[PDB]
């Protein structure tokens, strides 16, 4: 029942403020120095902060200054991240961890250790957005030179800027299925999603042959339709 | 541009050993402990070393840490599947006054034959410049192990801003998928007349290009 919960994430808008806070059971929470640290998706861990046990020793990163502190209360085993001025880099999951144990030893003295971050949290999604219900713009990959290699040329559909999650994607009505690649969107720093699908087709079948991505987006009640052919 | 230096990722075959390296200077690991985390899909980071070299209870004795100057290494023996993580080193840096992490090491246990991927770079279409807005799309198909650094050019030069890349992904055939966006204006688009997608993977580079005459 060693435990650390964050909470008091969420979706916010730019600008705006949060409380992070971080619950602590089964120790001693006074005794021990903690950290936040923060994961963007996709991204390496980057510390935020650090505090003291008894809360008069901090230190963060230079990039929060002025908009983010780190505190906590003993009295309520919490300890709390004030962010200020939220911006877009700041999207990510929030971690707090233990650290430092504080203690006396069976004859008085005062003893510490450092772990490093030796119990983390199980994480709290901070979203920095004003994303919200939005149907793609589709745009034709054409096929070329350049995405040609002898027989075989590749074509695609673009979907931009949707939100949210998911968009479908067919081919002249799902008839064709052989090579059709539709990838992983990508979450941009607006909060709106992007992906785009590719069908590989033979280079002799460019002039005859019809090609149509069918985009389907159901929380927008969207759909397109769109022909994909070379470029004059 | 992570202060500490690891490498994007290793790879080695069940039951083989592998280890993966953290560089940095005299104000981090050269003198200040390091530690090193394990963090499996979707959950949190977990401590594997501490002081160097130490391990947490009920960490086994397959993970090992060491240290030579401005350099330290995490060693695992044993492999097994369960192993198939990302990697990060920590220390503490004295000139910054702050934790400092590894950029992360993905470590993939070799389940199939590396494969090289696939990459098609297309330009903005006309329709979208129409639309006052300009996206490259780097698609990159068919690789294995699930890890690539893309790195894109504007006339040679490096261009970071505007960049967009997903987390590589498994497709039906196992092997993985990415792609990576570039967002331009058309007036930077058709400014310059090159830009290119280099695509790095287990060591073998390509790289494509486009151009507004195109």
């Known amino acids: 029942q060693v435990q650390l919960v964050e909470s008091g994430g969420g979706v916010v808008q730019p600008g705006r403020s949060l409380r992070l806070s971080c619950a602590a059971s089964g120790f001693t929470f006074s005794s021990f120095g903690m950290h936040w640290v923060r994961q963007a998706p996709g991204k390496g861990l980057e510390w935020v902060a650090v505090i003291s046990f008894d809360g008069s020793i901090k230190y963060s990163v230079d990039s929060v200054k002025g908009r983010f502190t780190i505190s906590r209360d003993n009295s309520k085993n919490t300890l709390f991240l004030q962010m200020n001025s939220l911006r877009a880099e700041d999207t990510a999951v929030y971690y707090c961890?233990?650290?430092?144990?504080?203690?006396?030893?069976?004859?008085?003295?005062?003893?510490?250790?450092?772990?490093?971050?030796?119990?983390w949290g199980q994480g709290t999604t901070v979203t920095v957005s004003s994303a919200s219900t939005k149907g793609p713009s589709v745009f034709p990959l054409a096929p070329s030179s350049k995405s040609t290699s002898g027989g075989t040329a590749a074509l695609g559909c673009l979907v931009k800027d949707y939100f949210p999650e998911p968009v479908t994607v067919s081919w002249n009505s799902g008839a064709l299925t052989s090579g059709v690649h539709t990838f992983p969107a990508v979450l941009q720093s607006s909060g709106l999603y992007s992906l785009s699908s590719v069908v590989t087709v033979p280079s002799s079948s460019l002039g005859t042959q019809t090609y149509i991505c069918n985009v389907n987006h159901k929380p927008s009640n969207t759909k397109v339709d769109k022909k994909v052919e070379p470029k004059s | 541009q992570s202060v500490l230096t690891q490498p994007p990722s290793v790879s080695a075959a069940p039951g083989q050993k592998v280890t993966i390296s953290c560089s940095g200077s005299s104000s981090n690991i050269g003198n200040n402990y390091v530690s090193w985390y394990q963090q499996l899909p979707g959950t949190a980071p977990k401590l594997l070393i501490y002081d160097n070299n130490k391990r947490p209870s009920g960490i086994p004795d397959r993970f090992s840490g060491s240290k030579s100057g401005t350099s330290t290494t995490l060693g695992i023996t044993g492999l097994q599947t369960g192993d198939e993580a990302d990697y990060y080193c920590?220390?503490?840096?004295?000139?910054?006054?702050?934790?400092?992490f590894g950029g992360g090491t993905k470590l993939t246990v070799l389940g199939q034959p590396k494969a090289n991927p696939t990459v098609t770079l297309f330009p903005p279409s006309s329709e979208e410049l129409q639309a006052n807005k300009a996206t490259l799309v780097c698609l990159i198909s068919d690789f294995y192990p699930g890890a690539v650094t893309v790195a894109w050019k504007a006339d040679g030069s490096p261009v970071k801003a505007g960049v967009e890349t997903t987390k590589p992904s498994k497709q039906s055939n196992n092997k993985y998928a990415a792609s990576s966006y570039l967002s331009l204006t058309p007036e930077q688009w058709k400014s310059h007349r090159s830009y290119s997608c280099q695509v790095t993977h287990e060591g073998s580079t390509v790289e494509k290009t486009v151009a507004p005459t195109e």
């Open positions: 961890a233990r650290d430092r144990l504080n203690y006396y030893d069976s004859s008085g003295y005062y003893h510490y250790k450092y772990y490093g971050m030796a119990v």
């Open positions: 920590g220390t503490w840096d004295s000139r910054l006054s702050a934790v400092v």
